[PDB]
């Protein structure tokens, strides 16, 4: 799936590569390795601050990409 068989997310298939290309890309990176590694269920749970980070970034950089 989604994850490299090292254990890493897997940033070269369109969508989900897609999304981690950017400036704010670094931001959706630390959001979903930090959510991955720590498998608790809910999208971010315990890792909020990057999820908040990812949204004042790129609601501020909508398509200037």
Not at 30 to 38: I, L
Not at 39 to 62: H, L, N
Request: aromatic fraction near 12%; charged fraction near 15%; proline fraction near 6%.
């Amino acid at each position: 799936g989604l994850i490299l068989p090292n254990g890493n997310i897997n940033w070269n298939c369109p969508c989900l590569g897609g999304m981690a290309s950017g400036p704010c890309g670094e931001q959706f990176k630390s959001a979903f390795s930090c959510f991955h590694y720590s498998t608790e269920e809910i999208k971010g749970s315990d890792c909020v601050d990057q999820f908040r980070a990812m949204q004042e970034c790129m609601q501020k950089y909508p398509d200037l990409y």
